Amino acid sequence: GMRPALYFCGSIRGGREDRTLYERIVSRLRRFGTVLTEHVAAAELGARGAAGGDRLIHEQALEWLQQADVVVAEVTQPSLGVGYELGRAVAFNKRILCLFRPQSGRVLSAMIRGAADGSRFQVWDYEEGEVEALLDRYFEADP
Amino acid sequence: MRPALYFCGSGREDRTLYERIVSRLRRFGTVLTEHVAAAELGAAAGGDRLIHEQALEWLQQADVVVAEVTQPSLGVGYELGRAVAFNKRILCLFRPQSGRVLSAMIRGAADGSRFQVWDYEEGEVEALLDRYFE
Ligand SMILES: [Cl-]
Ligand SMILES: [Cl-]
Ligand SMILES: [Cl-]
Ligand SMILES: [Cl-]
Ligand SMILES: [Cl-]
Ligand SMILES: [Cl-]
Ligand SMILES: [Cl-]
Ligand SMILES: [Cl-]
Q: Which residues of B touch A96 (CB under 8 A)?
A: none
Beta bridge partners of B111: none
The answer to whether A124 and A97 have CB atoms below 8 angstroms apart is yes
- CB crowding A91-116: b at 16 or more within 10 Å, else e: ebebebbbbbbeeeeeebbbbbbbbb
How many Cβ pairs closer than 8 A exist between chain A and B? Answer: 134
Query: What three-state secondary structure class fits B14?
Result: helix
Query: What three-state secondary structure class fits B105?
Result: helix
Q: Tell me the CA–centroid distance for residue B109 and ligand 3, in Å.
A: 29
Residue B87 class from Cβ within 10 Å (0-12 exposed, 13-18 middle, 19+ buried)? Answer: exposed
Nearest-angstrom CA–CA distance, A71 and A23: 16
Nearest-angstrom CA–CA distance, B116 and B89: 8
Nearest-angstrom CA–CA distance, A39 and A96: 19
Q: Tell me the CA–centroid distance for residue A83 and ligand 3, in Å.
A: 18
Query: CA quadruple A111, A54, B20, B31: dihedral positive or negative?
Result: negative
> Is A59 touching B (CB cutoff 8 A)?
yes
Backbone φ and ψ for B103, nearest 5 degrees, come out as -45, 130
Q: Which residues of A touch B107 (CB under 8 A)?
A: 54-55, 58
* Minimal-distance CA residue of chain B relative to A80: B77
Contact across the interface for A49 and B85, Cβ inside 8 Å: no
Contact across the interface for A78 and B72, Cβ inside 8 Å: yes
* DSSP 8-state class, residue A6: E
User: How distant is the Cα of B116 from the closest Cα of chain A, in angstroms?
Assistant: 12
The H-or-E segment that residue B125 falls in is: helix B125-133
- The CA distances from residue A89 to A117, A120, B78, B82, in Å, are 14, 11, 10, 9
How many domains does one find in chain A?
A: 1
* DSSP 8-state class, residue B124: G
Amino acid code (one letter) for A24: R
Whether residue A52 is annotated as binding a ligand: the answer is no
- The CA distances from residue A3 to A29, A35, A76, A85, in Å, are 12, 10, 28, 22
Nearest Cα neighbor of B78 from B4, B2, B1, B6 is B6
Q: Which residues of A touch B75 (CB under 8 A)?
A: 83, 109-112
Nearest-angstrom CA–CA distance, A111 and A71: 17
- CB crowding A13-49: b at 16 or more within 10 Å, else e: eeeeebeebbeebbebbeebbebbbbbbbbeeeeeeb
Backbone φ and ψ for A77, nearest 5 degrees, come out as -85, 125
User: Could you write out the DSSP letters of every residue in B41-102?
Assistant: ----TTHHHHHHHHHHHHHHH-SEEEEE-SS--HHHHHHHHHHHHTT-EEEEEE-GGG----
- The CA distances from residue B65 to A15, A67, B3, B30, in Å, are 32, 27, 11, 12
Nearest-angstrom CA–CA distance, B9 and A80: 11
Query: What three-state secondary structure class fits A15?
Result: coil
The CATH number of the domain holding residue A57 is: 3.40.50.450
* Minimal-distance CA residue of chain B relative to A61: B105
The H-or-E segment that residue B20 falls in is: helix B12-25
The answer to whether A71 and A89 have CB atoms below 8 angstroms apart is yes
Which residue out of A111, A119, A123 would a mutagenesis test of the B interface target, given it has the greatest number of B Cβ atoms within 10 Å? A111
- The CA distances from residue A142 to A32, A41, A101, B52, in Å, are 10, 27, 22, 26
Query: CA quadruple B94, B101, A65, A24: dihedral positive or negative?
Result: negative
Amino acid code (one letter) for B59: L
Nearest-angstrom CA–CA distance, A98 and A9: 9
Residue positions counted in chain A: 143
User: Could you write out the DSSP letters of every residue in A55-69?
Assistant: HHHHHHHHHHHHH-S
The answer to whether B7 and B21 have CB atoms below 8 angstroms apart is yes
Nearest-angstrom CA–CA distance, A68 and A5: 5
Nearest-angstrom CA–CA distance, B43 and B62: 27
Of residues A54, A78, A88, nearest to B73 (C-beta) = A78
State the residue range of the domain holding A32.
Answer: 5-141
The answer to whether B110 and B84 have CB atoms below 8 angstroms apart is no
The answer to whether A88 and B51 have CB atoms below 8 angstroms apart is no
Ligand closest to CA B95: 8
Nearest Cα neighbor of B38 from B23, B22, B54 is B54
- CB crowding B94-109: b at 16 or more within 10 Å, else e: bbeeeeeebbbbbbbb
Backbone φ and ψ for A52, nearest 5 degrees, come out as 75, 5
